[PDB]
Design a protein around this ligand. Sequence first.
Ligand SMILES: Nc1ncnc2c1ncn2[C@@H]1O[C@H](COP(=O)(O)OP(=O)(O)OP(=O)(O)O)[C@@H](O)[C@H]1O
Ligand SMILES: Nc1ncnc2c1ncn2[C@@H]1O[C@H](COP(=O)(O)OP(=O)(O)O)[C@@H](O)[C@H]1O
Ligand SMILES: [Mg+2]
Ligand SMILES: [Mg+2]
Lengths: 46, 487, 530
Amino acid sequence: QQRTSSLYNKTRQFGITAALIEILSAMSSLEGNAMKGVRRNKFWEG
Amino acid sequence: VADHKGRVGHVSQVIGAVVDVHFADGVPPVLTALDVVDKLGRDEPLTLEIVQHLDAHTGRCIAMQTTDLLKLKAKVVSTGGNISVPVGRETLGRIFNVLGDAIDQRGPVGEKLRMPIHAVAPKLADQAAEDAVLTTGIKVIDLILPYCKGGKIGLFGGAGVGKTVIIMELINNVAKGHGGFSVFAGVGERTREGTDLYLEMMQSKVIDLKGESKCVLVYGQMNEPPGARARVAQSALTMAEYFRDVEGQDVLLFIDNIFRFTQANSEVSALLGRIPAAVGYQPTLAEDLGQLQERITSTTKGSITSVQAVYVPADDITDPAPATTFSHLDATTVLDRAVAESGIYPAVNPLECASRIMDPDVISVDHYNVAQDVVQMLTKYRELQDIIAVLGIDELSEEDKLIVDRARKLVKFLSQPFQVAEVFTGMTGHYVQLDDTIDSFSGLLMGTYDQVPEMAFYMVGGINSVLEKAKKMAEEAAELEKMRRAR
Amino acid sequence: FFKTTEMIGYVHSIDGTIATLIPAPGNPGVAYNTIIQIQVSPTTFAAGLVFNLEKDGRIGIILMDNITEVQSGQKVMATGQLLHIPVGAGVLGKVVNPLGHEVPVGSTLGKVDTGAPNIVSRSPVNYNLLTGFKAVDTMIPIGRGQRELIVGDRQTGKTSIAVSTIINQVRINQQILSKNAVISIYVSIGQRCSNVARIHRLLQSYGALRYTTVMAATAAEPAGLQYLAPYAGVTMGEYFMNRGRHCLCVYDDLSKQAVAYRQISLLLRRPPGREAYPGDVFYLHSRLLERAAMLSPGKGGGSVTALPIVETLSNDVTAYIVTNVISITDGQIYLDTKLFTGGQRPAVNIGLSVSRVGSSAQNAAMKGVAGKLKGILAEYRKLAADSVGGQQVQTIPMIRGARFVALFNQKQPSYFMNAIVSLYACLNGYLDDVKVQYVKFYEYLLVHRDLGIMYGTAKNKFFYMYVQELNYLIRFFTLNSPILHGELEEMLKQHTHLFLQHYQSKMNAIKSEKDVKALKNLLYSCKRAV
Ligand SMILES: Nc1ncnc2c1ncn2[C@@H]1O[C@H](COP(=O)(O)OP(=O)(O)OP(=O)(O)O)[C@@H](O)[C@H]1O
Ligand SMILES: Nc1ncnc2c1ncn2[C@@H]1O[C@H](COP(=O)(O)OP(=O)(O)O)[C@@H](O)[C@H]1O
Ligand SMILES: [Mg+2]
Ligand SMILES: [Mg+2]
């Protein structure tokens, strides 16, 4: 029981971490593809 | 910008199955169908559906066919509205696709009206209360989780547990004699299964080519791109809604598999610039499924008896997609792989199924009492199995041995040979009447058949079949004894 | 219909139920978390909620209605005011939208986002709120102003308990003054329209719509509409709290609101957290549940009792949302699937259930009975835990624990007098000679019949179970009082004697093929009759 409980705790922590890392990796990939276009502002007026 | 019919646009981006179109006069409304008029040397026409507006001029769309040979700046012309699908009795006996084009090579179809595949679900005031038991001819379903006419049913299960076979049995038992019409929607499943279903329906005269048919088939399968698998269900549901409202008929709606709709949406979500949710489904998993489910309902005009097969990835019933579908059903049938591996078919787990009409007010008092007693006995047997594993059957009390014997007979008596699985089993199927099931289980619970051999309840029909099998077992055992006696 | 002030921008992008705007000429500003109207047509508007105010001037909007009519390039008007919904005694008995619109079925205004009462504005939870179930009212007391969590698995009775609690107040509100009447508010989140209709019919059957209002944000509605349902519900309930009255708010269920909020956040590009939920999910649920309080006597003495419902997958209470809700509410009512399938209904798992308020939320009589019932049940559980695979010993603690477990089985909520009298009878050993199978029949005869009057043996002057107005006398004077103790014991003794003499004697002599079935049917009917 002690060994299985330790494995259960370890597995849940790893699963949470892996899921969060996967989501953040997807978010970073989405952010990277985004490109900043030309700014249409009165640059001289400054 | 009211009438956008014929509005011209140009393809601005192509990444996988998602295409961006730029309109100089303004992007048409979302969910609008577009046709790629440019001649790109393609063997099939290309049609896009607007799903999002990036700005006042650009719109992100999803293609219904493969985007091969698609160039940038390709001319695109709006169709003036959403995707339309033919409706009416002229569609009976035919096979359609997501776009509503006949694919059975059986000549043109005479369509008098077409309806968009996207529609608003019925409101609260358009809800009808229909509490009537639906006899499927299956002992487990009729007893533990009876189905209700005009309600929603779900067949949750993994891969290879028997979801398709149960659907075929339900068709054979309910659709051949159904007063109204039927609509089968194949979503992201094997094409050979569709061919088998079509052949079976033609043999069973449900689809009478020379006469009058009473069912419609709409197929979007695995080979199709994700765009078609996310709208074939909408097309089939639109046909069912027309039959419900305009014809005022009672229609059956078989969907297999409803999980593929969610899977297709998740596949396309990544390219639409949406951050994945937990597990990796699209963030709009709940609302997308809810909008479709609310359309599958019985209103004051007609009734739809919907049977949906739900796929549970890797038998993980806690997965978000299976978990989100439970609240959208009136009767859930949960299949278990462990039951199937033990030779029990259908592999229904009665301790995980539920029915809304499992109330004394809707069903008879005897039916409710028998079902509750069966469930309680099965739960007690499951509890006692652990003690048996540790101590042993010999260590249990006589009060517990009787429960164990009765529970084993109940477990084997829930199995039934289907008329559609004769090749799998090699024996003729049975159709058990509702009253026969109740009487047989009531007798078994109180010990009227304590002396019957346990195996006499395995893969049989009513109680008469049990007695006949017991007699056959006794005869063969006597023959074996005689053979031993001579030796 | 929200009154608009001026145009703020134009619709730029649409992503399902999430839209973004761009500034109008002059870059006019819009107040954060305010209502905006999108001119989807010359005469129609689509409601929206401001959620983001980007630096460049773009505005993140959450569409609330008429989403199919929203297109890029449309004109957006701003109201400059928070969301206010109609509230008052004129909304009871109606199905209402989270935006305040009435939903057709077949007095003042209130902000949906308001701060909870401060520390000095609260009082200890002392007034009880009877759910009508012996198990809950005894082992998991609920007091007005408390936040009790109904956590369980699918198809375990989560909604049934809340609906019964709402219905249980109908018989009480009719008798006592409207000052102490409990006004219910059932919030349906992400459910089906059919379920809402069935619940409406069920409430109307018992005449609970007169004291109850239903707020439904069903499936096929935008996630934004489902995200505001609990807040609008509490706002409707907070109207009675700030006027010295008591309200009961039910959320069915917070599990779906979290999903809707996660969808809204992800579609608006906000940092996801554990299980993809944003970092504001705990704050959302806390500021929702913290608005349920028990005001001090200096502020009228009103209260709001919260009964959030949460669904666990495979009895996993380690989920992100489940843990957050458990850490906020004052106790929980855990429902076990095995108990539900085993026959125990309501399937309250007393072992995992807890009420942090304690006996303070119990009546004098109920507290007195529970003080000993809890110990008896604990001893019975301990003894049973050591006799799983062996013949049990029929000692007094077990002989009464079995009856107590048998009495907790019930379908409909029980009137206080009936439940307390039955618990007292079982506590003093009047059911020791009654078989566990006949406990329900014994209770039914005690409540709906009178053996003493039937056989012309009753000698009590006033204490009869058909006098339903003794409930308040029992509440004021505990059962262990000289005013009622003598006649209560006399009635219980006489009823037990007559039952054992007449009914159980015939039951033990049943030998036939039809009488056995008749007795079984009678016992099953009595199981769900009281
Ligand atoms: N105390 C009870 N006694 C008998 N039957 C009950 C009791 N409570 C609930 N039931 C029945 O159990 C079934 C499930 O109840 P309910 O609808 O409350 O479940 P739930 O927790 O809301 O599940 P869901 O996820 O479907 O909403 C229904 O058939 C209901 O009538
Ligand atoms: N009633 C049944 N009797 C015997 N075998 C069955 C039955 N139902 C399913 N099976 C088994 O499962 C196979 C069919 O699986 P199927 O119904 O397609 O499941 P799913 O669609 O859930 O993967 C059969 O070839 C057989 O091995
Ligand atoms: Mg299949
Ligand atoms: Mg519920």
